[PDB]
Amino acid sequence: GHMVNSFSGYLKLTDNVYIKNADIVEEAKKVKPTVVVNAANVYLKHGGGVAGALNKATNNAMQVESDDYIATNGPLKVGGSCVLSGHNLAKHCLHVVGPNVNKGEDIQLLKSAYENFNQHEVLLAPLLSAGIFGADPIHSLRVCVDTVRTNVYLAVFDKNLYDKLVSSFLEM
Ligand SMILES: Nc1ncnc2c1ncn2[C@@H]1O[C@H](CO)[C@@H](O)[C@H]1O
Is 154 in the pocket of ligand 1 (CB under 6 A)? Predict the structure, then answer.
């Protein structure tokens, strides 16, 4: 009934990593997690992917807040994060920058990116550096599982990708 961080329909991969075929925006709206993770760039310019979807669900409040934050502080580091408002989706949004391997950024920074998750007991998150950032999503899930020690609920939008991640994980 009425709780916050109530996750449902996740496959338990390990003691602390869960995965679901779901839209992270729809999950955030239902669950109202303490922390939702944004797949951000260093400029917190929420064009496309997860960032575009989260911002649109806040009616652009996330972009307004992000514009103010970056004008004040300057860009993040690749592999870095910042905690900003979760607006109407969550208590907080953890903006995490994975490497963009399509722009020749170092894949090693994906581990740094996931390390940010360890400062929060429970997160709703997407797979970092997958899609337009061009990392292999199987590799991103492996780095997540090997790096994150806190409770992470992964939302994978694409049915085929979800099925491929689960089959490859539970047969290794
Ligand atoms: N709304 C969404 N919810 C969850 N994952 C998403 C969403 N939109 C894109 N993705 C996936 O997130 C990854 C990049 O952040 C890619 O695998 C991409 O398919």
Answer: no
